[model samples]
Target: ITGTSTVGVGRGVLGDQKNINTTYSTYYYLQDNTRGNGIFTYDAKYRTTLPGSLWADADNQFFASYDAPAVDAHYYAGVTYDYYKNVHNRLSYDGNNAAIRSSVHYSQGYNNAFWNGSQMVYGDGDGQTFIPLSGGIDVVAHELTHAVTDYTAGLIYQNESGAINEAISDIFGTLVEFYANKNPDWEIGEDVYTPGISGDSLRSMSDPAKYGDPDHYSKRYTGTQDNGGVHINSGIINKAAYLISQGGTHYGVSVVGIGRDKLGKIFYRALTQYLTPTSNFSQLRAAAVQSATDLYGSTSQEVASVKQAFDAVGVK
Candidate 1:
C-alpha cells in the first residue's frame, strides 16, 4: 500500500502505552517505513497460515484489546532493528537493511514464538501457561535475533553449535532488553510467561540452574533429544555470557565483570566475524577470546573476562 509513514499510539498486551510506527493509505496500517526496508507486522488471525494480513485500523490510534499483540509485535521489531543498527553497526538481520516482518495471534492457544526462516511468528499462549508472547520484549527480540543468527553466523541448530545458536539469541535478547531499559533483567519471557504467577521466566541468565537448566559444561545434556539439546545445553553458554557481563562464581571458578556494553561488543564481533555453522563450545570460547582481543587488546580486562567467563562455565 502506498502511504506516508505515520506514528500511532497504542496499548500493548501488557496494557502499556507507547508509540508505534504505522502507515496511512486509507486505513492506518502497521507498516513502518522509517526503518531499514521497512518493519511490517501482520495478523495471523488464530490460524496456521503465515502473515495472514497487514494489520489495519480505521484510526491511527490503537486501543482495542484485540490490537494488543500486533501493537507489541510491531513496536518491538522496530526496537530490535534499532538494537542491531545502533549498537553493532549492522544494517539489519542480513546487514543489508532487510525488511523485518512478524505475525501475531498465530493459531489458537499456540504457546510459542519463533523465527520461521522468513519471518517472526508469535502464538497467543493458553491462559494457564502463558499469555500473548509478543508482549514480552525479550521474547520478541529473541526470535528476531534468530534471524540475525541465520544471516550472520549461520550457527547450526544442532548439538553444541545449536546450543551456541540458542545462547546467542538469548544473549542479544537480554542485551536488547537492557538497551530498551524496560524492566531489564537477566530473565527471558518473564513479562508474558504467567499472568497469575509473578517473578518467573522461561530461563534465567543470571542463574540457569534455577529453572532446571545446566549452568556448567559438566552437566550439559548429551542425549539425542531436542536437536542434541539445543535449548537445554544453551544454559551453559548463557551462564558464561552472564558471567562475562555481570561477573559470577560457580564451582570454585570466578569471573570479574566487565559490564554489558563490552560483553555485547565482544559477542557481536564473535558471532558476526568468528563463528561458523559447525563451531562447537570450545570453538565459541576461542572466538570470544579472539573477539575481545580484537576489540579491547590482548591484555584488557574484557579479554580476560571473556576467558574467565568461559572457564567458570567449564567451556574449555
Candidate 2:
C-alpha cells in the first residue's frame, strides 16, 4: 500500500465516528502509512484464511456497517503503537517499529481474537457472546501486548509462566485503555463483550472473583485445560497489579497506591529485564520488587507497595 497518504472518516462498531489513516491508489485502502512502517488491515471475509486481501473501499469514506470492524482495527492498532512508543519508549511490538498487521472478520460467528505469532487476528462475535472485538480498545491492545510479551520476555504459554504472560497483556491492555482515556476501567473487554448484557465483562482486575477467576494465589487452578489455566490463573497477578496502581486492601492486606505511570515503569522494567520464559508467581514478585527498587530506591514506598500488593494477592 505504498501510495499517497490520505485520511478517511468512519464509524466504529459502537457507532462512534473517528478519522482513520488510509492510502489512496485508485481506491482507498485500510493501510495507514502514518505509523511505523505502516498499519495494514485485511478483510478475513468470514473465512479462516491467514491475512486476507487488504481492505479496499470505493472512496475515502467508510460508513458501511460491515466496514466498522476494519476501521477500528486499523485505528486501534495505531493507538497501541503510540502507547508503547510514547509511554514506554518502545517502537512497535518488536522495538524496531515493525509494520503492524491485522485481520478482521475472521471465520463465521467467531468468538475470540488472538496474536497468531506474527500478526493480530480478530473475530466478529456471534452477536450473543460478543460483537466486533476490535470495537474494544482494551481487547485490541490485549492481543497486541501478546506480541510485546513474546518479543521481550518470551514467556512460555503454559502453567505459571503462561498465566504471567496473560496477566501482562491484561495489565498493559488496561493501561493502554487508560492512555486513550476512553471510558477507562479495571475491567477487560467490557465494551464489546456480551453487548446485550450490561455491567459484565470477560475479566475484572478490580475483582477477578466476580467472573470465577482467582484473585489470590491460593486459589490457582492446577489443571491442564486452557494451557494449564493461563487465562484463569492470570487473575492473581491482575489483582496484584490493580492493587499496586490503585491502593486497595485485598484479603485483609493493604497496599499504597503508586499511580499508573510508576506501575507501567516497574512492570515494563520487570518484563524487559528481570523476567524469564519460566518465571512463575514467586519470581514475578521478586522482579516487581527489584524493578520498583531500581526506579524508586530500595527504601521507597513504591518497593514496599509492590511487596504488599503481591502479598495481598497471596503471591508469596
Candidate 3:
C-alpha cells in the first residue's frame, strides 16, 4: 500500500459522512500512512478467513452501502490510535507505533468481532442481533484494547483473569468513546447492536445488572460457561470502574467520584505495570489501589476512590 497519501470521502455504517486516509497508486487502497507504520483495513468478502483483501476503491470515494463497514472500521481504528497516542502517550496497541489492521464483512450471519492476537476481524451481522460490528466505535476500541492488553498485561482469558481482561477492554473502550466525544455513554455496543431495538445495549457499565450481569463479587458466576464466565464476572470490575469515575453507592458502600482521566490513568498504569496473566479480582483491587497511589499518592482522593470503588464492588 505504498503510494501517494490521499484522503477518501465515505459514509460509515451509521450513514455518517467522514473522510479516511487512503493510499493511491492506480487504485485507492484503505491503507493509511498517516500514523505509526500505517493503518490497513481489509475486506473479508463474506468468507471466513484472515485479513481477506485490502479494501480498494476506484475513485477514493466510499459512499456505497457495501462500503460502510470498511469506512467505519478504518476510521475508528484511526480514532482509537489517536486516543492512545494523545491521552495515554502510547502509540498504537503495542505502544511502538505498530500498524493497525482490520477486516470487515467477515462472514454471513456472523454476530461478533475479535482481535485474534493480531489483526481485527468484524462480522457484518445477520442484521438481527447486529448490523456491522465495526460501526460501533466502542466495540472497535473494545477489541483493539484486547490487543493492548496482549502486549502488556497478557491477562489470561479465563476465570478472574479473563474477567479482568474483559473489564479492561470495556474500560478503555469507554474512555476512547469519551475521547472521541461521540454520543458517549456508559453503555457498550448500543450503536450497532440492534436495529429493531432502541435505547438498549449488550452491557452496561453504570449498571451491569440492567443486562443481568453481577455488580458485586459475591454475585459472580462460578460456572464453566463463557470461559468461566469471563464476560459475566466482568460486571464486578466494570462496576468498580464505573463507580471510580462517576461515583456511586453499591450495597451500602459509597465511592467518591474521581473523574475518568484519573480512573484511566490508574487502570492504564496497573495494566502496564502490575497486572499479570493470572490476576484475580483481589489482585486487580491491589493493582488499582497501588496504581492510584503511584500517580496521586497514597493519601490522595484518587487512591481512596480506588479502594472505595473496589470495596463497593465487594472485590476485597
Q: lDDT of candidate 3?
A: 0.94
Q: Model 1 segments beyond 4 Å from truth?
A: none
Clashing pairs in 1: none
Runs off by more than 4 Å, candidate 3: none
Lowest lDDT block of 10, candidate 1: 245-254
Residue-level error in angstroms, candidate 1, position 134? 0.5
Error of 3 at 145 (Å): 0.3
Whole-model lDDT values for every prediction: 0.92, 0.95, 0.94
**Per-residue alpha-carbon lDDT of model 1 for 1-316, expressed as tens digits?**
6899889998999999999989999999999999999999999999989979999999898899989999999999999999999999998799999999999999999899999999999999998789999999999989999999999889999999999999999999999999999879999999999889989999999999999999999999999999999989999999999999899787888899999999899999999999999999999999999999998899998888888889888888
**Candidate 3's residue-wise lDDT over 178-262, tens digit each?**
9999889999999988889989999999999999999988899999999999999999999999999999889999899999999
lDDT of 2 by residue, 19-56 (tens): 99999999999998888889999999999988999999
What would the TM-scores of all predictions be?
Answer: 0.99, 0.99, 0.99
